[PDB]
A and B are shown apart, each in its own frame.
Chain A
Amino acid sequence: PFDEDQHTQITKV
């Protein structure tokens, strides 16, 4: 899934 947490980074700006 493209919505994974593996390579899909996440940071609030």
Chain B
Amino acid sequence: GGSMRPPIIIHRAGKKYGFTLRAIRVYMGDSDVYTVHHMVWHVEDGGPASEAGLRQGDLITHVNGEPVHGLVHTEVVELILKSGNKVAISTTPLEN
């Protein structure tokens, strides 16, 4: 199921969306390869993202409907920025 979790439509606040994006990494239990994930580490209290429903410690699987599973921290950052006015952030639990 690709489309199941509702995206967090965050409104533009001048430039920032009111949250901190962090490219976390969990090493794979087999090789030396790692598993990089894009998770929001913090959401400003009363910020746009907070209003949109974005929480910290989730897992951003898609940005604007685009698969970001594999991109660099900046690719997704730009992606979000490129949205314009608002951005749909597909958030899902961070279970590991």
Contact = CB atoms under 8 A, between A and B. Distances in A.
Interface of A: 2-3, 7-13
A13 B81 contact: yes
B73 A13 contact: no
Interface residues of B, number: 18
A2 B24 contact: yes
B20 A10 contact: yes
A2 B35 CA distance: 10
A8 B23 contact: yes
B21 A8 contact: no
Contacts of A9: 22-23, 73
B37 to A, nearest CB: 9
